[PDB]
Amino acid sequence: THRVINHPYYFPFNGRQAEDYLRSKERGEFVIRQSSRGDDHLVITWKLDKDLFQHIDIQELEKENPLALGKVLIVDNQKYNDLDQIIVEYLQNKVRLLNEMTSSEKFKSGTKKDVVKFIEDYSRVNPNKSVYYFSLNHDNPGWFYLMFKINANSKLYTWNVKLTNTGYFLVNYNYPSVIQLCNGFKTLLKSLEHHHHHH
């Protein structure tokens, strides 16, 4: 600490400029900035993919006096003792997970309009078979949405998924692996068709 202000990754720029600066750079780049309105809080900016940027507000605690540094930093609903661990434990997992998910064949970037036409078209080819897919949401960056259709005469169903630093969270269910998540749904779909719930 006591060096986060001049930290190597420290760069004074506006919110718009920060994204622009990272625009020419590659994915997985981050920066450290201080908010005048915060005074006791810091804001970090990072790039996800293409025209997509997100900001995270870092809150420090355990301050005994104005000259006392926050020995405890809260990030992602998690408590970290050292700043260095936060950067490494966040970028390493986020970079690998983001790259693994996007690099997944089960990843299509279709718009809301293209989603209906996509599911409807596919459903048309398979009216007697169910289908499920997921895509990136623009209204809520970082979160994933699951859409699926049982049949052409079936109503379109869409669910929401929460992204965490431990994997993927689906309606209060953590899936450490995307493969398990894919079946997880298939298993649920099978159970749903039988309306047997548990027994």
Side-chain angles (χ1 to χ4, degrees), residues 185-199:
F185 212 82
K186 202 174 180 64
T187 311
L188 282 156
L189 182 61
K190 284 182 176 180
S191 50
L192 286 158
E193 289 176 357
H194 289 325
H195 292 282
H196 72 144
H197 295 293
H198 297 287
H199 282 299

Side-chain angles (χ1 to χ4, degrees), residues 119-134:
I119 191 66
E120 286 175 357
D121 180 355
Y122 191 87
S123 66
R124 183 177 185 87
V125 174
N126 19 108
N128 290 332
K129 274 178 286 198
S130 81
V131 54
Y132 52 81
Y133 282 107
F134 93 81

Side-chain angles (χ1 to χ4, degrees), residues 9-192:
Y9 288 88
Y10 193 82
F11 301 118
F13 287 90
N14 195 32
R16 287 67 270 274
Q17 297 294 304
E19 283 70 287
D20 291 336
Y21 185 63
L22 271 66
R23 185 181 297 279
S24 185
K25 308 290 194 180
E26 293 294 310
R27 296 176 182 86
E29 297 293 340
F30 71 112
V31 296
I32 299 168
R33 171 172 166 195
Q34 288 175 85
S35 173
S36 64
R37 291 179 180 175
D39 203 39
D40 293 339
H41 321 267
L42 298 90
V43 172
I44 285 169
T45 293
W46 73 304
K47 175 171 170 34
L48 302 70
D49 185 356
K50 215 195 296 315
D51 288 348
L52 196 67
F53 313 86
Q54 285 290 301
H55 61 322
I56 298 165
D57 290 11
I58 310 304
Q59 205 302 313
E60 69 83 2
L61 194 132
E62 214 295 298
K63 72 304 191 76
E64 291 176 1
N65 332 261
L67 306 178
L69 304 177
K71 309 296 196 180
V72 171
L73 305 178
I74 303 95
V75 198
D76 194 0
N77 84 72
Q78 200 88 104
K79 292 180 178 179
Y80 292 101
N81 291 118
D82 196 297
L83 185 67
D84 290 351
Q85 290 176 152
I86 293 170
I87 304 170
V88 184
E89 77 84 37
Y90 197 72
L91 272 69
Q92 294 291 314
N93 193 258
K94 296 277 284 200
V95 170
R96 286 177 164 275
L97 204 94
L98 183 139
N99 289 340
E100 179 173 345
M101 187 168 218
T102 311
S103 301
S104 72
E105 294 176 3
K106 297 169 272 296
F107 177 80
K108 288 177 291 92
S109 168
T111 61
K112 187 178 181 180
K113 183 177 175 76
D114 194 63
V115 161
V116 173
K117 187 176 181 292
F118 179 92
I119 191 66
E120 286 175 357
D121 180 355
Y122 191 87
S123 66
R124 183 177 185 87
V125 174
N126 19 108
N128 290 332
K129 274 178 286 198
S130 81
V131 54
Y132 52 81
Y133 282 107
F134 93 81
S135 52
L136 182 58
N137 185 278
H138 307 286
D139 289 349
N140 318 93
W143 279 35
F144 287 101
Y145 282 64
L146 282 157
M147 40 149 187
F148 66 106
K149 208 175 183 65
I150 300 84
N151 291 317
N153 297 303
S154 189
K155 180 176 180 59
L156 184 70
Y157 288 97
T158 299
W159 238 274
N160 309 311
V161 182
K162 181 178 179 63
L163 181 61
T164 67
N165 60 326
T166 322
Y168 303 102
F169 274 53
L170 186 143
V171 196
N172 313 117
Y173 296 104
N174 186 356
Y175 283 91
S177 293
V178 61
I179 295 169
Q180 289 292 307
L181 180 63
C182 296
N183 186 356
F185 212 82
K186 202 174 180 64
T187 311
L188 282 156
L189 182 61
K190 284 182 176 180
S191 50
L192 286 158

